Write a structure and sequence with these properties.
The PDB classes it as rna/protein. Two copies of one chain form a homodimer. Chain A contains five helices and four strands; from the N terminus they run αβαβαβαβα. Chain A is of the alpha+beta class. The first copy, chain A, has a four-stranded mixed β-sheet with strand order 1-4-2-3, sandwiched between helices. The two termini of chain A are 16 Å apart. The chains hardly touch.
Chain lengths: 117, 117
RNA sequence: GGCGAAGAUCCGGUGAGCC
RNA sequence: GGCGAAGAUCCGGUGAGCC
């Protein structure tokens, strides 16, 4: 298939909880273009990438480059569900964490749960 | 009426007739943005401004900003007449000549006819 | 109520085509 | 037939509002 990572529901939902309570403290990028070029700036602390993208063309590129710049990234759920997580009113194929707010020291834990594959 | 130098009709028609036969003879920029950059870059030797343009604004800036950069300019009644004269298929509020093609002597005499009203 | 991060609006550049 | 130098298309920035 498109993205080559598999991930249980519980930690995907951990991604939506972290992304749901990051906005009040840090910064987040919404949408695949802002994610791709915000990370291409080198400013990603954790990337959101989803497989329910149609056509797969939409994001079939960013996990690989997020492995190059060695920025964390996680395959998560439905575009809609993350859309609610980042708190915009529309589906979202890809997101990013740009500033860690007052929470900071969980994002590392999540990156190493990503390193499991 | 932003006509700050009232130009005769016969002189308008001679200017548009001259402007008719200089589009593979010389080079002309079409449209208020291309005319205004023609004056700003500094490569316009004679710009045409139509006076029935509405809103006036759309080209109202170009005679004064044109005079300051000391590029001559001449006034024309209908935007339509100018637009069809400069062989494009739509009305045109403002035009410019940036290269005089082979017509150095006629445009020279006409420029001196402008500087005088 | 419809459209919208599968990118709304706006801006810059480009300059004669697009349906 | 319609739209178009009162800027078609295309490219750029911006990132959440527009009817």
């Amino acid at each position: 298939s498109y993205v080559r990572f598999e991930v249980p529901e519980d930690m995907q939902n951990e991604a939506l909880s972290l992304l749901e309570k990051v906005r009040e403290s840090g910064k987040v990028k919404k949408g695949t273009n802002e994610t791709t070029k915000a990370v291409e700036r080198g400013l990603a602390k954790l990337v959101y990438i989803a497989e329910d993208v149609d056509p797969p063309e939409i994001v079939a590129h960013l996990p690989l480059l997020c492995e190059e710049k060695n920025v964390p990234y996680i395959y998560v759920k439905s575009k809609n569900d993350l859309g609610r997580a980042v708190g915009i009113e529309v589906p979202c194929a890809s997101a990013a964490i740009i500033n860690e707010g007052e929470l900071r020291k969980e994002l590392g834990s999540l990156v190493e749960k990503i390193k499991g594959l």
